[PDB]
Structures are given as structure tokens and as C-alpha cells.
Design a protein around this ligand. Sequence first.
Ligand code: CL
Ligand code: ZN
Length: 133
Amino acid sequence: SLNDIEEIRFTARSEENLRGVHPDLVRVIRLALRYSLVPFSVSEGLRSMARQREMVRAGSSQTLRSRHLTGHAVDVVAMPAGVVSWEWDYYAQIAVAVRRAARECGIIVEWGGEWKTLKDGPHFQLTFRDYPA
Ligand SMILES: [Cl-]
Ligand SMILES: [Zn+2]
């Protein structure tokens, strides 16, 4: 399938799941697709209120307030060689690309890999300070 794909990027998959995300975050993530050594897609951009309610009920979020509800966050999924992986180092590499793209765009993007506790690689968001809601 991918033997002749000299540089693997999941552009189309990502752009589809970026629909409805804040345009400034979209711009950063699109640039990060160019820079990342690790292919990735956006597995979740906009999240419904019902999904967030389900997460609160189940205990995977404390609050119904989520940056995903308003367009201010994405969860990425690492796709090395077209295969999903959850291994940390892939997400650290994606975050290098996001950090570069963000800097170039003059936008701070917070990464879940730098949460104070329970670090998790997929999550990126625009800050509440810069992008209130
Ligand atoms: Cl930086
Ligand atoms: Zn997230």
C-alpha cells in the first residue's frame, strides 16, 4: 500500500477532522503536518456536549467545560507507516512539530504531554488566556 509513498502524511484525514476547529489552531496543526517526522491524524477536534457529558459520567473528565466543545482543541493520533500507535515517543515528536508551527504562527499551543500530572500525548489546545471562551 505505502511502499511508494516517499513521504507519508495524513493530510486529507486530518483536514476532515479539523472541520469546525478554531481557524488559528487549524493553521498550526496544518503546518505541523509538514514538519513532523511522525505521520499523524486528528482523531478528535470538535466534541459534542453529549460526548463530554458521557466523559464526565464515566470519570474521564471532571468538567463539562472542555476546549474541544468550542473548537479550541484537537487530539492527534500517531500513524507511523499508516498504523495507529499510542507510544509516547511518537507524540513527543509530533509535539516538536506543533511547537515549531505554533511559534512560527505566533500562537501558544498547550500540549497534554506537558500537563502537570497525568501527561498524555494526544491533546493540544489554544490557551484560555489567548483565546477565551
Ligand atoms: Cl517554543
Ligand atoms: Zn483532548
